[PDB]
């Protein structure tokens, strides 16, 4: 009685599930071959990024022992990147399998203490990247909830956009890196909030008369603005 | 030719992906949904109404608010069944054995 007879058609018919499998098993069904994803992009640890940090390009220090070999983003990518899907793009900035910095705690109170001091969340440390489908499902659910909350809101799609950007930037595992990308949309939402309040409650100001040199040149047009 | 998509363009990549031989419905990609809160919400609402766990589990139903069904499954029914018959008989359409039915389906769906 053999185990899993009908379960490896990829093996029976020489079908590769990915170019890495194609290269390994020598099926040679990928016309364009395979450029292997190196190990420093397949795995690694979280690092510091800013140049105004002294430990830049250095691994993050934790209370627990952790491999200090860092994930290296793709800084010099090839011109032709035949697969431009999210699956292949995310590997240039994050590892698909998550970082190699996760702890295995000898006790529950160490876990408790790390959480209490802000140094551990399983959301962050025991987790993979999110797939495009998962991200899209989350974004559409969030959009539905917001539309139900209020349809007649002008900051709606801006909130939805910051959510989308956070999800795409993987803020569960790199929240500081994702917030660095998404705070612009947060600022825009902050602006839209006031822009809506001042339209609801009629707020205006006495504008001064027109300046003598509003136009720089007489033949120039003075385009009228509301 | 296929150039790198920076991280700032990924939100646009999710809803306007590049062309493939197997594309999704980009117009329906904002309509794909799958609620992880469906059954928890159902249980919470029923237990708040006052039912028991057994009553809640008997009254539970799976979410209808999921991604809509392909209309081709209702419009090209007979053509698809015939294509599947051809595939089952001819080993998945090896060396172009279901091209007749597949081409009829493609023309019907595409119209030039």
């Amino acid at each position: 009685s053999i185990l899993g007879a009908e379960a490896f058609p990829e093996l029976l018919s020489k079908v590769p599930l990915n170019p890495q499998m194609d290269e390994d098993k020598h099926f040679n069904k990928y016309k364009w071959g395979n450029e292997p994803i190196p190990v420093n992009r397949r795995t690694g640890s979280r690092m510091n990024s800013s140049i105004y940090d002294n430990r830049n390009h250095e691994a993050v220090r934790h209370p627990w022992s952790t491999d200090a070999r860092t994930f290296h983003p793709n800084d010099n990518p090839e011109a032709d990147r035949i697969n431009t899907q999210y699956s292949n793009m995310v590997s240039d900035s994050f590892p698909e399998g998550g970082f190699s910095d996760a702890p295995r705690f000898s006790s529950n109170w160490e876990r408790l203490l790390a959480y209490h001091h802000g140094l551990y969340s399983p959301e962050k440390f025991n987790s993979t990247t999110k797939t495009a489908d998962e991200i899209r499902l989350a974004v559409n659910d969030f959009a539905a909830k917001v539309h139900a909350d209020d349809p007649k809101n002008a900051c709606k799609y801006l909130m939805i956009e910051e959510f989308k950007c956070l999800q795409s930037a993987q803020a569960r595992i790199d929240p500081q890196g994702a917030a660095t990308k998404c705070v612009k949309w947060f600022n825009e939402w902050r602006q839209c909030a006031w822009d809506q309040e001042k339209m609801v409650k009629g707020y205006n100001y006495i504008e001064d008369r027109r300046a003598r040199k509003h136009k720089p040149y007489i033949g120039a047009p003075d385009l009228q603005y509301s | 030719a296929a150039s790198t998509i920076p991280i700032s363009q990924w939100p646009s990549l999710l809803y306007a992906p590049p062309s493939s031989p197997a594309n999704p419905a980009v117009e329906a990609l904002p309509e794909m949904q799958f609620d992880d809160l469906h059954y928890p919400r159902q249980m919470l609402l029923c237990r708040g109404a006052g039912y028991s766990l057994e009553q809640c589990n008997r009254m539970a139903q799976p979410d209808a608010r999921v991604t809509p069904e392909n209309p081709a499954e209702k419009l090209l029914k007979e053509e698809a069944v015939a294509a599947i018959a051809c595939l089952s008989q001819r080993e998945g359409g090896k060396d172009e054995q279901c091209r007749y039915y597949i081409e009829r389906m493609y023309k019907l769906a595409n119209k030039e």
Binding site: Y157, L158, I160, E161 | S12, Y15, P30
Partner: peptide, 8 residues
């Protein structure tokens, strides 16, 4: 579609 997918 959303208004921010427009860029041009």
């Amino acid at each position: 579609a959303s208004p921010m997918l427009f860029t041009d």
